[PDB]
Every structure is written in C-alpha cells, then in structure tokens.
C-alpha cells in the first residue's frame, strides 16, 4: 500500500474541490501512484495527496481541449485531470490507475 506502483511527470489541474468547481490551472507535476493514493509533488513534501479508495476514473476527452486526458473524482468530491502529450505513457498511467482503484474495491 505504501509502495510506489508508478511515478512520472504529468500535467495536472484541479477542477473541483469538495464538489465545488475551480478555475483550471494546468501545470506539470511529479505524480506518485501508491497502492492507495495519488500523490502530487512540485518535483521528483507533497503539494497534495488523495486516497483512491472508491475514486471514479474515466476518460476526460469531453472535459478539456487537450489530448490524452484522464479525469478522477474522489469520494470527498475533489476532481482532477491528468494529461500527457505521450499517448502510450498516458495509456500506461490509465491502466495502472485502474489496477490500483479496482484493487481497493476487493482489498
């Protein structure tokens, strides 16, 4: 659970906090996926962390003009987009995030 499943640089923006909409502010983030949370740093203490238990993950093609976007909405209501210009690495992230989120459903 504390172990790192994936880490890498992605572009990210918050879009809601506790169910309230936020102005986007896209920027690069060093992103760390553990066995139960996604952790954001300015570079390789976290700026922020979210628990992924019960998170809703989807494609975010409808939520941005950017290419290769994922949308995550957490149980407390925080919502984020992740994006990369590199479609294969974005797909790798999508699969890793799916794996961790689904794992929290059964364990």
Residues making contact with ligand I3P (CB under 6 A): 23-24, 64-66
Write the DSSP symbol of residue 24: -
Are the C-beta atoms of residues 80 and 13 closer than 8 Å to each other?
yes
Least distance from ligand I3P to the Cβ atom of residue 103, Å? 29
CA distance 60 to 17: 17
Least distance from ligand I3P to the Cβ atom of residue 73, Å? 15
Phi/psi for 104 (5° steps) reads -65, -20
Least distance from ligand I3P to the Cβ atom of residue 107, Å? 34
Q: Which is nearer to ligand I3P, 6 or 66 (CB)?
A: 66
Q: Which is nearer to ligand I3P, 65 or 88 (CB)?
A: 65
Are the C-beta atoms of residues 90 and 68 closer than 8 Å to each other?
yes
| Number of C-beta neighbours around residue 78 at 10 A | 19
Q: Which is nearer to ligand I3P, 94 or 103 (CB)?
A: 94
Least distance from ligand I3P to the Cβ atom of residue 25, Å? 8
Q: Which is nearer to ligand I3P, 37 or 79 (CB)?
A: 79
Going by their DSSP bridges, the two strands 79-83 and 4-17 should be labelled as antiparallel
């Amino acid at each position: 659970s504390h172990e790192v499943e994936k880490s890498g640089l992605l572009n990210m923006t918050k879009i809601a906090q506790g169910g309230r909409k936020l102005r986007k502010n896209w920027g690069p983030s060093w992103v760390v996926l553990t066995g139960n949370s996604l952790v954001f740093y300015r570079e390789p203490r976290p700026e922020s962390s979210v628990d992924l238990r019960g998170a809703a993950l989807a494609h975010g093609r409808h939520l941005s003009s950017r290419r290769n976007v994922l949308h995550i909405r957490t149980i407390p209501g925080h919502e984020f987009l992740l994006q990369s210009d590199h479609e294969t690495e974005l797909r790798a992230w999508h699969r890793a995030l799916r794996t961790v989120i689904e794992r929290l459903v059964r364990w």
